[PDB]
A paper describes a structure:
S-layer proteins (SLPs) are self-assembling, crystalline proteins coating the cell surfaces of many prokaryotes. We determined the atomic resolution structures of all functional domains (I-III from N- to C-termini) present in the three S-layer proteins SlpA_ac, SlpX_ac, and SlpA_amy. The Lactobacillus S-layers are anchored to the cell wall through interaction with teichoic acids (TA), either lipoteichoic acid (LTA) or wall teichoic acid (WTA).
The N-terminal part, exhibiting the first two domains (SlpA_I and SlpA_II), is known to be responsible for the self-assembly of the S-layer protein into a regular lattice. The crystal structures of SlpA from L. acidophilus and L. amylovorus and observed crystal contacts reveal the self-assembly formation. One basic tile is composed of the homodimer of the full-length SlpA, dimerized at the SlpA_II domain. The self-assembly region (SA) is formed by domains SlpA_I and SlpA_II, building a 2D crystalline network that forms the exposed surface of the SlpA layer.
Author numbering:
A (entry chain A), B (entry chain A): 213 to 260, 265 to 309, 314 to 326
The structure:
């Protein structure tokens, strides 16, 4: 009964996607900018009586997801970007996940 | 210089996908069957002199990825399935990741 939607237009989604640019000199991304891009684009709710549902994923959850995928993240949150990688957003009222695939211009 | 390909036809890929069916009574999936489905479909290599590259993700890596996405996995590897979720396969010669989105018939 928890579903995700695109903020800009209100359409329900069951997968997500992001286009990002890495730093032009170091070719790095920061974990906190990936999470903020995701939460600027997607949100969650419960349908009717209907209400917003909190997205529980925080910056250390995302750091741990990436670390277990073989990606190395330094103490500042920076990591060398891949052309393609993914992570899950979680929401809890009833739990639900939104898989997000990221493409990086590098 | 590491790339992934579909085993059945040899086409290079930069994202992956899987269709799975959960257990008809419990609605559960096991982590080890998800990983075996992924490795039956996708592999990695380095292009020329060319050679196969090992996929390093094992069953405890995948368990830790899912746990950090809010999904609960019991000591036997079983978890209640979502309609949509994702994980990353890693390969190391030069590192590379393949994001895989799973859809579940439930």
């Amino acid at each position: 009964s928890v579903s995700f939607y695109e903020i800009a237009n209100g359409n329900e989604v069951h997968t997500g996607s992001l286009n990002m640019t890495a730093n032009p000199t170091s070719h790095e991304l920061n974990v906190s900018a990936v999470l903020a891009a995701a939460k600027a684009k997607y949100a969650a709710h419960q349908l009717e009586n209907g209400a917003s549902v909190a997205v529980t994923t925080d910056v250390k959850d995302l750091t741990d997801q990436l670390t277990k995928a073989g990606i190395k993240v330094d103490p500042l949150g920076n990591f060398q970007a891949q052309a393609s990688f993914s992570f899950n957003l979680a929401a809890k009222s009833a739990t639900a996940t939104l898989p997000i695939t990221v493409s990086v211009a590098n």
